[PDB]
Amino acid sequence: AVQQNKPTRSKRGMRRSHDALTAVTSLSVDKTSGEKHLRHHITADGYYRGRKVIAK
């Protein structure tokens, strides 16, 4: 099964109208290290909710 007519650039765009990515609404700030992180994830420096969970 294959198209009988070439779909337009218009139809292509209409289809892609749902493809836009969603940005993270807000980053969280660690209460101790003050660095930004994904909510409920640890920070880049190994902090979670003020606690130095992971070292090195």
Partner 1 sequence: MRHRKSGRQLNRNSSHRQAMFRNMAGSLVRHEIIKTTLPKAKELRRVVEPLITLAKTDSVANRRLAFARTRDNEIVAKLFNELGPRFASRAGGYTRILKCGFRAGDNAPMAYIELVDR
Can you give the binding site for partner 1, defined by CB under 8 A? Answer: 38, 40-42, 48, 53-54
Q: Is 16 helix (H, G, I), strand (E, B) or coil?
A: helix
Nearer to partner 1, 7 or 46 (CB): 46
Cα distances from 3 to residues 6, 7, 8, 12, 13, in angstroms, run 7, 8, 12, 14, 17
Nearer to partner 1, 18 or 40 (CB): 40
Query: Applying CB under 5 A, does 19 fall inside the site for Mg ion?
Result: yes
Measured from the CB of residue 33, what is the shortest distance to RNA in angstroms? 10
